[PDB]
């Protein structure tokens, strides 16, 4: 029963300023492993549409460069219907985008999301949803976790061990009261490189709306959504809150 979105919508305005400070965790370089290249424009645009407190997520699709099979260039970010929360997010199914142009040979590389908490590993909720999404579908999908906090954004990319996938399957819900035998060893540093010499684009639900906090029960996690290329709306866009306009419209 709170009116605190006001404060939050105003805050999101300034999110672009955080892009002055972009940190990417790079440990020891390895030539035997895959490296993931995220276009800087996609980071920029993805932050700008994000929220200051609520978590926001998207799938990432790309393909191996012509030269190196182990260099996975990210080509597209796919915003799907989701329901954001603090420190967690309910994400709808891996989208069907086969009918779309320029998707010839696209590989599902994993997902990307914001976070209000800096870490060296995948949190519980990260493992919970990561498993739910990719457990039965694709195990090598990575998790690009973006920690955005007043002043900067910090990017870390993780793989998930089969143990992690088991744990996530067991802990299916998001209210993890058990938190039983969680392990920072589930996740694993993944090489994430940021590049501004390659440009990427978004794919979005046909009805535009991807954020369903105010849409409420209209969010169906098992929904078959249709998609298209397009410019994603920001978190507190007009179409994301007919309620606020209705509440005002009357009386």
Swiss-Prot record:
The MPN (JAB/Mov34) domain has structural similarity with deubiquitinating enzymes, but lacks the residues that would bind the catalytic metal ion. Contains a region with structural similarity to reverse transcriptase, presenting the classical thumb, fingers and palm architecture, but lacks enzyme activity, since the essential metal-binding residues are not conserved. It is found in: Nucleus. This is Pre-mRNA-splicing factor 8. Present with 468 molecules/cell in log phase SD medium. Component of the U4/U6-U5 tri-snRNP complex composed of the U4, U6 and U5 snRNAs and at least PRP3, PRP4, PRP6, PRP8, PRP18, PRP31, PRP38, SNU13, SNU23, SNU66, SNU114, SPP381, SMB1, SMD1, SMD2, SMD3, SMX2, SMX3, LSM2, LSM3, LSM4, LSM5, LSM6, LSM7, LSM8, BRR2 and DIB1. Coiled coil: none annotated. Residues 35-164 form the MPN domain. Functions as a scaffold that mediates the ordered assembly of spliceosomal proteins and snRNAs. Required for association of BRR2 with the spliceosomal U5 snRNP, and the subsequent assembly of the U4/U6-U5 tri-snRNP complex. Functions as a scaffold that positions spliceosomal U2, U5 and U6 snRNAs at splice sites on pre-mRNA substrates, so that splicing can occur. Interacts with both the 5' and the 3' splice site, as well as the branch region. Has a role in branch site-3' splice site selection. Associates with the branch site-3' splice 3'-exon region. Also has a role in cell cycle. It comes from the Eukaryota.
């Amino acid at each position: 029963s709170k009116n605190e979105w006001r404060k939050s919508a105003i805050a999101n305005t300034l999110l672009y300023l955080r892009l002055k400070n972009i940190y990417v965790s790079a440990d020891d370089f390895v030539e035997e492993q895959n490296v993931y290249v995220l276009p800087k424009n996609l980071l920029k645009k993805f932050i700008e549409i994000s929220d200051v407190k609520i978590q926001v997520a998207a799938f990432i699709y790309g393909m191996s460069a012509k030269d190196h099979p182990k260099v996975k260039e990210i080509k597209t970010v796919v915003l799907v219907p989701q329901l954001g929360h603090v420190g967690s997010v309910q994400i709808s199914n891996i989208p069907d985008i086969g009918d779309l142009p320029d998707t010839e040979g696209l590989e599902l590389l994993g997902w990307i999301h914001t976070q209000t908490e800096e870490l060296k590993f995948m949190a519980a909720s990260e493992v919970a949803t990561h498993s739910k999404l990719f457990a039965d579908k694709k195990r090598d999908c990575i998790d690009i976790s973006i920690f955005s906090t007043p002043g900067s954004v910090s990017l870390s990319a993780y793989n998930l061990t089969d143990e992690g996938y088991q744990w996530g399957e067991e802990n299916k819900d998001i209210m993890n009261v058990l938190s039983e035998g969680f392990e920072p060893t589930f996740s694993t540093h993944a090489q994430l490189l940021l590049s501004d010499r390659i440009t990427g684009n978004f794919i979005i639900p046909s009805g535009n709306v991807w954020n369903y906090t105010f849409m409420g029960t209209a969010f169906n996690q098992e929904g078959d959504y249709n998609f298209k290329y397009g410019i994603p709306l920001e978190f507190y866009n007009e179409m994301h809150r007919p309620v606020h306009f209705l509440q005002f419209s009357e009386l």
